[PDB]
Design a protein around this ligand. Structure first.
Ligand SMILES: CCCCCCCCCCCCCCCCCC(=O)OC[C@H](COP(=O)([O-])OCC(O)COP(=O)([O-])OC[C@@H](COC(=O)CCCCCCCCCCCCCCCCC)OC(=O)CCCCCCCCCCCCCCCCC)OC(=O)CCCCCCCCCCCCCCCCC
Ligand SMILES: CC(C)=CCC/C(C)=C/CC/C(C)=C\CC/C(C)=C/CC/C(C)=C/CC/C(C)=C/CC/C(C)=C/CC/C(C)=C/CC/C(C)=C/CC1=C(C)C(=O)c2ccccc2C1=O
Ligand SMILES: CC(C)=CCC/C(C)=C/CC/C(C)=C\CC/C(C)=C/CC/C(C)=C/CC/C(C)=C/CC/C(C)=C/CC/C(C)=C/CC/C(C)=C/CC1=C(C)C(=O)c2ccccc2C1=O
Ligand SMILES: CC(C)=CCC/C(C)=C/CC/C(C)=C\CC/C(C)=C/CC/C(C)=C/CC/C(C)=C/CC/C(C)=C\CC/C(C)=C/CC/C(C)=C/CC1=C(C)C(=O)c2ccccc2C1=O
Ligand SMILES: CCCCCCCCCCCCCCCC(=O)O[C@H](COC(=O)CCCCCCC[C@@H](C)CCCCCCCCC)COP(=O)(O)O[C@H]1[C@H](O)[C@H](O)[C@H](O)[C@@H](O)[C@@H]1O
Ligand SMILES: CCCCCCCCCCCCCCCC(=O)O[C@H](COC(=O)CCCCCCC[C@@H](C)CCCCCCCCC)COP(=O)(O)O[C@H]1[C@H](O)[C@H](O)[C@H](O)[C@@H](O)[C@@H]1O
Ligand SMILES: CCCCCCCCCCCCCCCC(=O)O[C@H](COC(=O)CCCCCCC[C@@H](C)CCCCCCCCC)COP(=O)(O)O[C@H]1[C@H](O)[C@H](O)[C@H](O)[C@@H](O)[C@@H]1O
Ligand SMILES: CCCCCCCC/C=C\CCCCCCCC(=O)OC[C@H](COP(=O)(O)OCCN)OC(=O)CCCCCCCCCCCCCCC
Ligand code: HEM
Ligand code: HEM
Ligand code: HEM
Lengths: 535, 92, 53, 203, 223, 164
């Protein structure tokens, strides 16, 4: 009554619907097993956490700006005027059982979300997963990053703790007023009044439960549909031509490791949602516009923005009776970088000439100027971030505060040039380091030559050898070639027994002969498939 | 020794004529591998011009303007040396 | 589209706050401005007492 | 492949040879042991003055210096020296399991030494001296505490070499690694015999 | 006691008169004047340790104390007899009062610390950066009498929150807040500093995201 | 309409005096849900129309669900191929009904505040074993428990219309 009822309900599902065609198409789909192809899954797998916590945070949070005295449990805030957003965020922190944990693992899931989006953008950038067939997928993923950034900024500003209330005052109301023609108009449309306009926090709650995460969920749905139906890309390797995806199928293997990786991402978020404090809004105060911190720094995925405020050197213009302030520039500048980050595949489609349907990836050493432009962007992000904690860097690492913001202000101009030089020539030297492992072998320990005194490194060749001390030099194929005989089948047979006690020797012989024959069968089947493609 | 060969037929491509030869960079057909060099010359020169424009601001510490002159003169010296060596074909 | 946006678009330069000159807009008006003529606007501190004075 | 050109027992080789050739990681860790003995000479000279200074009953009044918890963990550590030497006897004769059993129990009672020294530090700081509290308390906390860092680094070497025995075939190079970590840690607990004679017995 | 003034003078002559001129004056462009600052100022500036200092830099930082409580009273009463100003609050034993200074309220101290000064330091009293090399220090290693005499006579770049700017009820109230904000544990995990999002970012990357990418490279292979 | 109504509605039960434009409610204590629903009605340009066409769209929604259930019932559109479609449509009717009830109770106008008192708090207390427990879990307190209207706003923007 456990397999018979499964067969009966399966024939019922096949009777009502006719799914088995469009289920077999799904659970025979192959995803490749490279590790970096899990990175964007983190941006999925934390995002579901952001719903599963976040829904829970919706049914306790009360947005308002109606000024209430606390009269609750938290003693250093009693009788103090606070917005009811902050009061019920304090109630999430201290009243409800396991409430501080759910809101902390929610904030940590937001950090892992907006950081894994950046890690995965680094993946699909430097591996070249964005040219011709997947450029719209880059565009909707880039827009998904923009919505992630703005929506998280609506997130930690949603209680008006004053560390983020001054973040609204800096970013969302100083830059918004600082836009030339229609700046004040979109400010007073966004707030409905002055800066503590009484319908800001509920408007952010409206945009932040549903209105931006509805668009984020729609773009993730269409995004994973573009990854799903239009097949996944892959690195080139042994049996990996342009028009096939090699790897594991969905049903026995990929579903198990994907669900287990969802569970381990949730484990990392839960461990660091418990063991590490985040946004301690009771240590912070209610937002009152006459008191600040010293840090006053945003969350890290937006620290490149007002760090760009912290580094742009006070250039204001004054036309005939008006004022362009500094905040126009970064309102241009954030509009600049996004217009380079959305529209990059069309930019280098124009520059390079990549008018070809690319499915195989390119290793990020194989494309040195694009990896170097990318490392310019990575190090420029790291500079604009690492000079946004300008304050606390100059605090702890004892530097003059003026000195470290000048270090940033020169660094955003000269350090992309330095990292472009180092990145371009480092990619070319990584190419040359695995283009001499083909013309020579793989390096090992030293033998001396017998009749005279020499020292050869005793290279182990990768392909066919000639009759003498040099092999037939292979051609490059976009693959990671192994540079250690370690990573080949050399000395990789320890005792199979236990960590403390050995198994009997016939069992060791059976296990190592069976595993050796299975690995031999793996490379034999992959090699004969590779010969079937060309032959 | 427990490895197979690797063979990848890509879509190889300007189409393999103008750019960098496959002996200057060891894999030029496998991806985009040459920025045009006037772009990086004018990028360095415009970087140094931006560092020289950065004097204009709220400013009383003139110990900084010597750093701006220094990091602008280093970039102008590198760009000028690099352009002069390509004007003479990498000589002296 | 204007029915979407028209509920949002407020004029920031509608004169809202009463001032000594008359009704000025909000950006040219803090609470430091006089309401009718020279009135005593005391530069009072905020002794952070919960509610009473 | 054809067969290989580096047709050896492993990708790792011994360090040169050890039948008519000295082992080279052996002499490397011997001279680095000697350097760390000079490091302990720096710590001993920070001890043997600031004991010529304090006169009379010189270990000060909050330092009820516990010997009844000191001499059991020294006895643990120097019996663990013989467990580690039995591990290297089972490393010369080439079985990973005789190595791993004796180094697991050596790591366990070396961890017991580190936890006993940590409990001695808790029990001697909560009703006694602190490192800004005394001269003798500070030199006691640094002359044996950075020895605690030496033995916790030796424990890191034990767990690290045990994972290394998990991941590869037992070569003579790995017996070289085992004998090197073996008498690094033998140096650690001969320096601790020197420190335990110095601090507690000789004073 | 006049012998206590003499003890203050004996310690005064042999520690500072290279930079205070031995008539309690200011040696010009080497050390400022010292009269009128008073016993409270000398208690905070030597009991913390700071002013028996060694260079004139961006700001003279914290250090171990160069004199003890049996001598700070001598040195502060000597500077108050030569000058005269704010004095350190003392209990019914004549010694420096350090536990009778924590006020009966914290939430008023929270709002008043937060309004009046936590711009400079932090919310819980961690440090904050200042303009040209100078910086606010952490308030964790701060004796409550040093906190009262820190706000009472402002040493370096901080405003002296006087006896009339903040009333002693308010100052006892602020030192009630900071000795139970830099002392209370971080509710709900490790306190990544006191200031929020930059340590939370850096501990997202190398603790959380490095572990996530390590799991992702243990699960998936590489090719 | 409803997205448009989210970025003007402020749920609360913090008691505010009106001090706006509507003259028969001035100086009267009101929840801020009701105050900003009055602001949707009278402040914003074309606001009363969008909230009215929102309520009429809710009526045409929950009435056309009933008309269509009559269609697929009486025409027999629910047997062997499509009984799961009937089940998820029926659950969709249940969520439509409960979610609209969370809807017109979301401003606490007292014609629907007494609807919360009758339906959502008299029937909820009136459940034998676990009745009072699910009442005090749903409200967090008494009947004007200060986290009812934001919980209905939470269930009513996203949490029930996400399932819908
Ligand atoms: C009359 C002429 C005018 C007068 C000239 C004066 C005459 C000569 C005087 C001497 C000049 C003084 C300086 C002497 C240094 C030269 C010595 C040298 O380099 O060694 C030779 C040699 C280099 O060979 P080479 O002679 O230069 O020629 C190589 C190629 O021909 C060239 O290589 P290439 O073709 O590949 O060029 C690469 C480079 C092009 O070369 C250039 O022209 C320079 C360009 C800039 C350079 C900046 C620094 C990078 C250089 C590396 C420095 C690393 C430190 O392109 C780049 O990598 C940078 C591109 C810049 C991009 C634009 C920046 C945009 C930033 C983003 C903007 C954002 C702003 C707003 C932000 C808002 C965001 C929205 O060095 C070596 O091989 C080994 C080095 C060993 C180092 C030992 C030194 C001690 C180290 C101690 C540690
Ligand atoms: C409140 C609270 C404290 C905060 C919120 C935190 C939140 C609720 C934590 C729980 C998250 C969630 C419910 C836990 C799920 C983890 C599970 C799935 C453990 C994995 C173990 C493993 C054996 C599952 C096997 C997967 C099963 C067999 C298949 C299902 C399946 C999955 C799970 C896929 O991810 C998948 C991806 C792509 C294609 C297909 C599949 C697929 O068929
Ligand atoms: C042709 C062919 C060859 C194709 C290739 C070339 C092609 C791809 C070139 C791309 C286009 C190029 C890069 C120029 C486009 C960039 C332009 C200048 C758009 C910038 C937008 C700008 C004009 C309007 C300013 C409005 C900004 C973006 C939003 C305002 C704003 C708001 C509203 C905030 O809420 C906010 C909150 C917190 C911080 C900041 C902001 C903020 O700046
Ligand atoms: C890939 C690249 C961005 C190319 C895009 C195309 C480019 C031309 C578009 C224009 C961009 C240019 C003009 C301006 C730069 C602005 C910038 C790109 C803003 C967009 C946001 C986003 C795309 C940022 C870039 C992606 C991000 C930096 C990738 C992460 C770095 C790497 C590759 C991932 C692995 C790192 C992982 C293993 C952890 C290692 C630990 C290291 C120390 C982390 C570094 C680090 C980081 C990255 C923090 O953000 C951070 C924030 C707060 C505190 C501390 C840290 C911190 O230590
Ligand atoms: C992870 C490792 C990172 C290592 C990075 C190491 C940093 C490189 C060198 C930095 C040199 C810093 C020297 C600063 C020394 C200094 O204090 O000078 C100040 C201002 O100088 C300056 O900042 C100019 C120097 C700018 C440096 C150029 C930047 C180079 C780039 C490439 C480095 C960026 C690295 C960022 C890393 C991020 C990660 C990237 C992957 C003067 O202003 P100030 O002191 O406040 O005022 C004065 C009164 O104090 C005083 O009494 C009175 O007398 C007057 O002088 C008055 O003006
Ligand atoms: C997303 C698409 C973006 C498209 C933007 C361009 C489309 C513009 C269409 C709107 C046209 C005007 C609609 C009617 C408006 C009208 O009649 O305009 C009067 C005086 O303006 C004017 O002539 C100037 C009109 C020029 C428009 C300038 C603003 C354009 C954009 C850039 C602003 C950004 C908006 C979207 C971003 C915000 C994001 C939100 C999440 C207001 O005097 P006021 O006295 O404040 O009356 C108040 C009642 O309006 C008000 O509803 C009522 O609430 C009362 O407050 C009442 O006081
Ligand atoms: C296992 C069973 C479950 C138990 C729960 C385990 C979860 C931990 C929470 C339990 C309570 C512990 C938190 C204590 C309460 C607490 O907040 O933790 C403070 C933070 O202090 C410090 O840092 C010193 C701590 C040093 C320890 C090691 C540091 C942690 C590292 C590993 C974090 C990694 C971050 C990423 C590195 C970035 C990479 C860079 C390349 C330490 O308090 P304390 O030392 O006594 O005094 C404070 C003064 O530090 C403070 O300057 C003073 O201002 C006051 O706050 C005072 O109270
Ligand atoms: C530089 C390293 C120099 C020496 C390392 C010695 C290791 C041995 C540790 C000594 C243990 C001990 O006994 O510390 C007792 C006292 C307790 O006094 P309290 O806190 O005032 O009590 C409260 C009363 N109200 O330590 C203290 O001050 C508190 C600090 C705790 C020990 C310092 C950190 C230990 C590890 C140092 C990190 C090494 C980094 C190496 C990088 C190359
Ligand atoms: C919330 C944000 C994101 C989510 C949920 C997400 C999700 C995913 C997933 C699950 C994959 C397949 C796994 C993999 O290939 O690694 C993927 C691939 C991809 N994503 Fe992302 N990602 C996000 C961010 C981005 C960004 C910022 C871009 C730009 C982008 C564009 C792409 C592209 C082009 C691919 C196909 C490349 C490939 O197959 O490796 N995505 N995305
Ligand atoms: C799209 C991805 C999301 C991100 C990056 C994000 C980010 C954040 C962040 C950083 C906070 C501040 C948490 C704190 O420090 O207390 C927050 C709060 C919140 N989140 Fe989200 N969120 C996301 C989606 C959602 C969703 C889908 C929901 C509900 C269905 C939700 C509900 C909430 C609520 C109600 C709050 C405010 C309560 C509080 O902050 O204590 N979030 N969010
Ligand atoms: C699932 C179908 C829905 C139904 C049947 C429904 C029903 C209702 C009803 C009857 C009202 C009361 C209107 C009034 O008399 O003022 C209401 C209000 C509201 N609706 Fe919905 N609604 C639905 C979906 C949504 C969605 C999807 C959103 C937002 C994305 C939304 C946003 C709102 C808001 C914020 C209010 C309160 C503002 C006010 O009542 O003035 N509704 N809803």
């Amino acid at each position: 009554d456990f397999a018979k009822l499964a067969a009966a309900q399966g024939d019922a599902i096949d009777s009502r619907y006719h799914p088995s065609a469009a289920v077999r198409r799904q659970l025979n789909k192959v995803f490749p097993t490279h590790w970096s192809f899990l990175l964007g899954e983190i941006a999925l797998y934390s995002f579901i956490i952001l719903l599963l916590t976040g829904v829970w945070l919706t049914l306790f949070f009360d947005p308002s700006m109606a000024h209430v005295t606390y009269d609750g449990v938290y003693q250093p805030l009693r009788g103090v005027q606070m917005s009811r957003a902050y009061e019920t965020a304090l109630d999430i922190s201290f009243e409800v059982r396991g409430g501080l944990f759910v809101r902390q693992v929610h904030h940590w899931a937001a950090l892992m979300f907006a950081a894994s989006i950046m890690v995965h953008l680094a993946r699909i950038f430097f591996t070249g997963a964005f040219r011709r067939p997947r450029e719209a997928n880059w565009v909707i993923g880039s827009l998904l990053l923009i919505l992630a950034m703005f929506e998280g900024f609506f997130g930690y500003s949603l209680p008006d703790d004053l560390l983020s209330g001054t973040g609204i005052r800096a970013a969302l109301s100083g830059i918004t007023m600082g836009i030339p023609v229609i700046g004040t108009w979109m400010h007073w449309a966004l707030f409905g009044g002055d800066f503590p306009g009484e319908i800001l926090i509920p408007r952010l709650y409206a945009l932040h439960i549903l209105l931006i995460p509805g668009i984020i969920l729609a773009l993730i749905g269409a995004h994973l549909a573009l990854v799903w139906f239009q097949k996944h890309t892959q690195f080139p390797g042994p049996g990996r031509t342009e028009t096939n995806v090699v790897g594991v199928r969905v049903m026995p293997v990929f579903a198990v490791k994907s669900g287990a990786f969802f569970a381990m991402i949730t484990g990392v978020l839960g461990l660091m949602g418990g063991l590490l404090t985040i946004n301690p809004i009771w240590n912070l105060g209610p937002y009152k516009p006459s008191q600040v911190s010293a840090g006053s720094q945003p969350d890290f995925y937006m620290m490149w923005t007002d760090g760009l405020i912290r580094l742009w050197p006070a250039w204001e213009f004054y036309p005939f009776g008006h004022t362009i302030p500094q905040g126009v520039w970064v309102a241009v500048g954030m509009g600049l970088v996004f217009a380079l980050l959305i529209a990059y595949p069309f930019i280098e489609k124009k520059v390079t000439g990549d008018d070809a349907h690319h499915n195989l990836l390119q290793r990020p050493r194989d494309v040195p100027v694009r990896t170097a432009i990318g490392s310019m962007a990575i190090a420029l992000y790291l500079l604009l971030t690492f000079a946004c904690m300008n304050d606390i860097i100059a605090l702890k690492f004892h530097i003059s505060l003026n000195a470290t913001t000048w270090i940033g202000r020169i660094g955003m101009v000269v350090l992309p040039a330095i990292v472009y030089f180092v990145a371009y020539r480092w990619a070319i030297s990584l190419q040359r380091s695995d283009r001499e492992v083909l013309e020579h072998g793989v390096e090992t320990g030293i033998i001396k030559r017998l009749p005279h005194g020499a020292y050869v490194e005793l290279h182990q060749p990768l392909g066919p050898v000639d009759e003498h001390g040099h092999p037939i030099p292979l051609e490059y194929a976009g693959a990671p070639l192994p540079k250690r005989m370690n990573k080949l089948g050399s000395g990789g047979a320890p005792g199979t027994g236990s960590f403390l006690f050995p198994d009997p020797a016939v069992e060791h012989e059976a296990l190592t002969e069976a595993a050796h024959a299975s690995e031999h069968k793996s490379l034999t089947a992959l090699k004969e498939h590779q010969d079937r493609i060309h032959g | 020794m427990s490895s197979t060969q690797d063979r990848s037929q890509l879509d190889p491509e300007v189409e393999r004529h103008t750019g960098v030869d496959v002996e200057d960079v060891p894999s030029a057909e496998w991806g985009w591998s040459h920025m045009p060099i006037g772009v990086m010359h004018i990028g360095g020169l415009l970087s140094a011009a931006f560092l020289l424009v950065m004097m204009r601001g709220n400013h009383v510490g003139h110990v900084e303007d010597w750093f701006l002159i220094g990091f602008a003169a280093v970039i102008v010296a590198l760009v000028g040396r690099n352009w002069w060596l390509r004007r003479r074909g990498w000589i002296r | 589209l204007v029915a979407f946006i028209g509920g949002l678009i407020k004029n920031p330069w509608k004169p809202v706050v009463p001032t000594a000159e008359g009704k000025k807009a909000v950006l040219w008006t803090s609470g430091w401005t006089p309401r009718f003529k020279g009135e005593t606007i005391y530069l009072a501190r905020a002794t952070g007492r919960p509610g009473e004075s | 492949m054809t067969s290989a050109v580096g047709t050896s027992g492993t990708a790792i080789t011994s360090r040169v040879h050890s039948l008519n050739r000295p082992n080279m990681v052996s002499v490397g860790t011997i001279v680095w042991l000697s350097s760390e003995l000079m490091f302990f000479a720096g710590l001993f000279a920070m001890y043997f003055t600031a004991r010529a200074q304090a006169g009379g009953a010189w270990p000060p009044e909050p330092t009820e210096l516990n010997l009844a918890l000191a001499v059991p963990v020294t006895l643990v550590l120097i019996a663990s020296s013989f467990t580690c030497q039995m591990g290297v006897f089972a490393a010369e004769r080439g079985d990973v399991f005789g190595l791993r059993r004796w180094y697991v129990i050596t790591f366990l009672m070396g961890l017991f030494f580190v936890l006993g020294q940590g409990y001695e530090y808790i029990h001697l700081v909560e009703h006694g001296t602190t490192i800004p509290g005394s001269a003798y308390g500070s030199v006691f906390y640094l002359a044996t505490g950075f020895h605690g860092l030496h033995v916790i680094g030796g424990l890191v070497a034990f767990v690290l070499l045990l994972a290394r025995t998990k991941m590869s075939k037992f070569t003579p190079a790995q017996a070289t690694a085992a004998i090197v970590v073996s008498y690094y840690w033998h140096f650690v607990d001969i320096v601790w015999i020197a420190l335990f004679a110095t601090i507690y017995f000789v004073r | 006691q006049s012998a206590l003034l003499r003890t203050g003078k004996q310690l005064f002559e042999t520690s500072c008169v290279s930079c205070h001129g031995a008539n309690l004056q200011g040696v010009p462009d080497r050390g400022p004047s010292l009269i009128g600052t008073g016993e409270a100022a000398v208690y905070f500036q030597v009991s913390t340790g700071r002013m028996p200092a060694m260079r004139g830099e961006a700001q003279a930082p914290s250090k171990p104390p160069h004199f003890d409580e049996s001598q700070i009273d001598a040195l502060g009463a000597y500077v108050q007899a030569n000058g005269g100003g704010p004095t350190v609050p003392r209990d019914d034993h004549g010694a420096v009062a350090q536990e009778s200074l924590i006020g009966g309220d914290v939430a008023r101290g929270g709002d008043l610390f937060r309004l009046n000064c936590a711009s400079c330091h932090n919310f819980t009293g961690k440090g904050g950066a200042l303009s040209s090399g100078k910086y606010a220090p952490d308030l964790g290693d701060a004796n409550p009498a040093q906190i009262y005499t820190a706000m009472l006579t402002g040493p370096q770049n901080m405003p002296k929150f006087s006896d009339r700017q903040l009333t002693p009820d308010e100052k006892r109230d602020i030192v009630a807040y900071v000795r139970e904000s830099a002392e209370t544990p971080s509710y709900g995990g490790y306190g990544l500093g006191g200031f929020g999002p930059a340590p939370e970012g850096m501990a997202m990357w190398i603790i959380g995201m490095v572990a996530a990418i390590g799991v992702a490279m243990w699960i998936g292979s590489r090719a």
